[PDB]
């Protein structure tokens, strides 16, 4: 309960909760880097233009 | 009784140490993020000098 060196639950959260979010954040960070292109913003305009 | 009054001081003295270390370990974890920010910047400048 207090939290020993190798507590099954607490220790598991240290590697799971932390790393999982890290990868998730990386996806958004790396995903935003790939979406910074100005040609992708022109495609959005195309979509609206093509539908009209 | 003499010892009782003298041994009680340690309890409160040791309790203060734990209270101070609790906030110091959180700052140590926060330093990591800041350290990586300047470490990536230092390497970024080195990569800019390789061109």
């Amino acid at each position: 309960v207090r939290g020993m060196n190798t507590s099954s639950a607490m220790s598991a959260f240290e590697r799971m909760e932390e790393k999982v979010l890290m990868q998730e954040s990386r996806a958004q960070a790396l995903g935003e880097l790939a979406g910074a292109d100005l040609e992708t913003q022109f495609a959005q305009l195309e979509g609206g233009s093509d539908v009209d | 009784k003499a010892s009782l009054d003298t041994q009680s001081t340690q309890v409160e003295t040791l309790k203060r140490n734990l209270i101070q270390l609790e906030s110091k370990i959180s700052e140590a974890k926060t330093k990591k993020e800041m350290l990586k920010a300047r470490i990536t910047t230092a390497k970024a400048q080195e990569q800019l000098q390789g061109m």
């Binding site: 990386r26 958004q28 960070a29 | 990586k36 061109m51």
Partner: peptide, 27 residues
Amino acid sequence: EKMLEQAILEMQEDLVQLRQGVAQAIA
């Protein structure tokens, strides 16, 4: 050519690390 090809391939691979570092900074 020999001194340009090697530099062109090494200067482009260094940008990938820079982008990865920015992702970590963004994270």
